């Protein structure tokens, strides 16, 4: 049976806050399709050669 992720109880209370004391600069890659090959078929030459 598949795991959905690690389980985590966030430390919530009516007067507690967490504040980050540092940071990390992250570089992420996203790849997107933009075009496909421009095919052409001559219908008469495909069908009748």
């Amino acid at each position: 049976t598949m795991s959905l992720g690690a389980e985590n109880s966030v430390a919530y209370s009516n007067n507690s806050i967490a504040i980050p004391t540092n940071f990390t600069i992250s570089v992420t890659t996203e790849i997107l399709p933009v075009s496909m090959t421009k095919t052409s078929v001559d219908c008469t030459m495909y069908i009748c050669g």
Binding site: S40, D42, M45, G49
Partner: protein, 49 residues
Amino acid sequence: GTGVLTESNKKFLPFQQFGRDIADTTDAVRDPQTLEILDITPCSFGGVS
């Protein structure tokens, strides 16, 4: 058929008379008189715009 005949580097085994493409079309021939192996490529074609 109709095409451009040319001498070829295809090593036909002694029992083979034709070569065929993915489309069943004859891609090469053995000449019946002098046993040359000839490629066949179609005569050049394209859209006119």
